[PDB]
Amino acid sequence: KCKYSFKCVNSLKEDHNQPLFGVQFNWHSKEGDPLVFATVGSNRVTLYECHSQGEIRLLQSYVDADADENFYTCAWTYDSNTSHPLLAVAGSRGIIRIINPITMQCIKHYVGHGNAINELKFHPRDPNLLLSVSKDHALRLWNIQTDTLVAIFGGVEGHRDEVLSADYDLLGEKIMSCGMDHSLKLWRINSKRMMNAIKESYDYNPNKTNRPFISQKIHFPDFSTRDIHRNYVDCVRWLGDLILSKSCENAIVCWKPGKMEDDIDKIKPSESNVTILGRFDYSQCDIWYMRFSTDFWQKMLALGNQVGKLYVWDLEVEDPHKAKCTTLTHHKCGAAIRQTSFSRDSSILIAVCDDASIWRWDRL
């Protein structure tokens, strides 16, 4: 069976009784500091600290001025000069907030077109490069060091409906996005053009110049498919050169562009084939906006469903379809799980729910 066994050690619930839409552990936390995770739901973000005996210690929240803000997503990075962690949050107002997680001060914020942001992701090798996916059909890439919009990934050949999820590949050379138009789309960011644009974003200082920073309008993905799912594609991750993606059809598909022997870096915009390498089925998850996560090493994969059941897959197997499943249930956990998060060391798994409950599963 599955190499990984968890026991439920604690549970709690936030005062607001709104859905907790996102949970992220901080993977940039220093050696010897306790494991910290952030939740988003309602118009706030909250930080907790994990301790022994399953204790989840409440710290401090950032509550938005606007009572109409609903936070959907968060991501951790760090300040590239001082070593300090940063937390970006976003939601329905379409405003990105950079939060100092110590004081919970909002350091600065970015405004796109002001339409819901569904997901945020930081570059795996550049802590400054923030990617946001939006209800307005577009993805934007930001440089949060020089406070510049590097590019908009949109256009007619872009997504024709909400973008719900996106992921950088390992070296942060290409992005794969997905959304309500049933399509998964590839956008390379290692082209001459984009590497140059990123470099220019680093040279830009508004006080040393007269020009505004000109962003790139990227209107053509480098690959596209609608052959994986038959509904809203709400979650995507890279597993090396392979893709893991889901819709609301109770399945996580493992797939790649082109035929079996096709190299990912040789795939052209016209490519018409994909190759299904496997599919992990589960039950009762046919609402949309239900995100799986993986641990740091990508050894395992966790997904909650709509009645409070957790699925964990052991990916540490020769081929994708050989993955080992185990399930985590609790009698008092009955509300929908929106997202899971592993700690960096993999000893703790956190699930969050539509009833504002938080569930802590510790690894045996």
Partner: peptide, 8 residues
């Protein structure tokens, strides 16, 4: 396809 149990 709803975000939650009977939505819009």
């Amino acid at each position: 396809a709803r975000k939650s149990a009977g939505a819009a």
